[PDB]
Design an enzyme around this catalytic site. Sequence first.
Site, PDB file in Angstrom:
ATOM      1  N   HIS A 110     -26.457 -57.948 -22.828  1.00 15.85           N
ATOM      2  CA  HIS A 110     -27.649 -58.559 -22.250  1.00 15.85           C
ATOM      3  C   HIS A 110     -28.841 -57.605 -22.304  1.00 15.85           C
ATOM      4  O   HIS A 110     -29.414 -57.254 -21.256  1.00 15.85           O
ATOM      5  CB  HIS A 110     -27.371 -59.011 -20.823  1.00 15.85           C
ATOM      6  CG  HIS A 110     -28.384 -59.966 -20.270  1.00 15.85           C
ATOM      7  ND1 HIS A 110     -29.608 -59.558 -19.786  1.00 15.85           N
ATOM      8  CD2 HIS A 110     -28.340 -61.309 -20.101  1.00 15.85           C
ATOM      9  CE1 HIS A 110     -30.281 -60.610 -19.354  1.00 15.85           C
ATOM     10  NE2 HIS A 110     -29.534 -61.684 -19.534  1.00 15.85           N
TER      11      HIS A 110
ATOM     12  N   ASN B  26     -31.685 -63.822 -24.662  1.00 21.01           N
ATOM     13  CA  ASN B  26     -30.374 -63.291 -25.023  1.00 21.01           C
ATOM     14  C   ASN B  26     -29.522 -64.344 -25.723  1.00 21.01           C
ATOM     15  O   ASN B  26     -28.902 -64.067 -26.757  1.00 21.01           O
ATOM     16  CB  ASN B  26     -29.660 -62.765 -23.777  1.00 21.01           C
ATOM     17  CG  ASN B  26     -30.377 -61.587 -23.148  1.00 21.01           C
ATOM     18  OD1 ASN B  26     -30.117 -60.434 -23.489  1.00 21.01           O
ATOM     19  ND2 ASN B  26     -31.285 -61.873 -22.222  1.00 21.01           N
ATOM     20  N   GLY B  27     -29.474 -65.558 -25.171  1.00 20.24           N
ATOM     21  CA  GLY B  27     -28.621 -66.586 -25.746  1.00 20.24           C
ATOM     22  C   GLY B  27     -29.040 -66.985 -27.148  1.00 20.24           C
ATOM     23  O   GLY B  27     -28.199 -67.141 -28.037  1.00 20.24           O
TER      24      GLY B  27
ATOM     25  N   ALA C  94     -28.151 -64.321 -29.552  1.00 21.50           N
ATOM     26  CA  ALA C  94     -26.702 -64.262 -29.716  1.00 21.50           C
ATOM     27  C   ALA C  94     -26.214 -65.344 -30.673  1.00 21.50           C
ATOM     28  O   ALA C  94     -25.465 -65.060 -31.619  1.00 21.50           O
ATOM     29  CB  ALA C  94     -26.018 -64.386 -28.355  1.00 21.50           C
ATOM     30  N   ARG C  95     -26.628 -66.594 -30.442  1.00 21.49           N
ATOM     31  CA  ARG C  95     -26.317 -67.657 -31.392  1.00 21.49           C
ATOM     32  C   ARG C  95     -26.851 -67.327 -32.779  1.00 21.49           C
ATOM     33  O   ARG C  95     -26.243 -67.704 -33.789  1.00 21.49           O
ATOM     34  CB  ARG C  95     -26.892 -68.990 -30.906  1.00 21.49           C
ATOM     35  CG  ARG C  95     -26.456 -69.388 -29.502  1.00 21.49           C
ATOM     36  CD  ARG C  95     -27.059 -70.725 -29.086  1.00 21.49           C
ATOM     37  NE  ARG C  95     -27.244 -70.820 -27.639  1.00 21.49           N
ATOM     38  CZ  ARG C  95     -28.401 -70.616 -27.017  1.00 21.49           C
ATOM     39  NH1 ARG C  95     -29.487 -70.321 -27.714  1.00 21.49           N
ATOM     40  NH2 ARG C  95     -28.475 -70.720 -25.697  1.00 21.49           N
TER      41      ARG C  95
END
Lengths: 330, 330
Positions: A256, A262-263, A266-267
């Site tokens: 994080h 962040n999401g 990440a994806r």
Amino acid sequence: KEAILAAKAAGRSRKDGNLERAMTIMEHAMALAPTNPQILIEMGQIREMHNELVEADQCYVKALAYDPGNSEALVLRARTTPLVSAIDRKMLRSVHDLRDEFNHLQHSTALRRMMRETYFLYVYHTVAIGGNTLSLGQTRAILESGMVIPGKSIREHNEVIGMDAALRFLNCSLLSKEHDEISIDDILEMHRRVLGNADPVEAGRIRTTQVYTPVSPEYVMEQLKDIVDWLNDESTLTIDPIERAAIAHYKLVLVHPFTDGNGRTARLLLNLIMMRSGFPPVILPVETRAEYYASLHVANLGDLRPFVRYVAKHSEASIQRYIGAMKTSS
Amino acid sequence: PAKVKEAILAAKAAGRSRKDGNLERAMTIMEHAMALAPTNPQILIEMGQIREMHNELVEADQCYVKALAYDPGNSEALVLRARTTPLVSAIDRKMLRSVHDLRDEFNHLQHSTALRRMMRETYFLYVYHTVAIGGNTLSLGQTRAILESGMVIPGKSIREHNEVIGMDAALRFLNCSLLSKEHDEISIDDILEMHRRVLGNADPVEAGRIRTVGRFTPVSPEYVMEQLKDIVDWLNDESTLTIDPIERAAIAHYKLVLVHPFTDGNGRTARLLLNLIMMRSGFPPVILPVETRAEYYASLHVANLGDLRPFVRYVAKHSEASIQRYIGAM
């Protein structure tokens, strides 16, 4: 509270010669605060009678994560884990077979359909999962007309724009075979493009205040270098590509390193890894949002397998979407 | 083959014969001869002399300077300008002293509600005007709705919104970080974060970043950064504190525009730096209105011929206009 534990004893009484009555009782108390392996272990069993092996195993793993040393959960899991590992290995086998079954036709329609509509689908789904109220048609309208959609905030627009920029960078700098080394400044640039238009102060920026089931402390960097080195490590080619991407996404979202964004990043890393391993774009749809987040929380309890099964689920769903898409083409 | 429309050689031979005949007609004839050959030295000379007999000395001097810059070595222009120069220097000092006194009685204003209302209000007019010179089609009311109401105008370009927003957060940064008396300095990173603020939302990849010996490139980061170092060093040198703040701001604007250190947003950052210098010398925000855009560039035009005086008269004019806006507000 502990009263219904006697109703886990009532599903204990039922389970011996029963059908859905045991599930009737356990559905109830189950929804009454899953924390004691007493209810989660028994629910694991009741699931197992339905030949729901992986869900049973999940109940056992969770009973262990909440109660380290609970020996009935321990034994039941020691009996359930090898079968679950065989099943997961099988799932990966299948999705890979479908993967190289996909790499056969490079029609101009594959270009047309996949390259364009899966681009807009990926943008729309990634921003939408993050609560964006934009539709697919409004997202593509933003991307190719650049005007403002009525009734939508400017920050949603900027999320779509930034996602487009980050995808461009990923495709024309990180998906080339000549640059077979993923740097840390590459991740920083990916986040800077993801969040640049929406939040210029924090785009490409490591958080100072690392607030909070918490996240790794004020030492994120060395862990970012750990991620990069693992991606570029030479042993990671032996690991299954899908679990490789899922572990990267995991590693990241646990680190994080940014205040926000962040999401999406990440994806993004997940999609990058899978696409460099011969896979078409993997779309985690917004309709499955719930399960998505759900699996991630289980991942923070020590069990990444639900998330891996999720990524395999929707990667195979996308590939078969494509084969079935140009089987009706012709 | 530089050819000139015949109609004006006839207009050049005619104008030689009279002035002294009460011929205002000569001014309109030479004006119709200005609309077709604006770069013709003798027309600029004659038009200048007409301006002299019409007791507009500054514009006459301008026609002489322009004729001499267009025709290097033209001794007619040299002697005429040799007459006009000390007078127009005097006039300019008169103007600057006037603006400074008006500014001294602006800082002697005690107001409570109307003042701040106006301050926040100004806060916005500046963004609209400085972005409208940049080619932004957003209206003053639309800009006001964006910044003040959090509104969004659909059907209009997203980047225009992001330019308004970026300029607003920029002006905020200038007012609440660069005017604190604990600073009294102008680092390169102040200009760099003013640029990162200007283009942050609209173009985050190049915001706060300078445009890019084994090859032979004329542009490399160390050189452009070095010119910025020369600029800031000139700004903080004490000898340059002795000159009039208006001229200091104008010269700074010119130098920053000519160095061209960013890929885009140079003009907005230049007017912003001008405003910064002006405000650190006790002036209210200097708004160069978009209605005067023409004159703006026009003055800058003369600046590249070697004469910064029209630009200085310009920014002095609109500085006095801002002050007089606040003063007339009560």
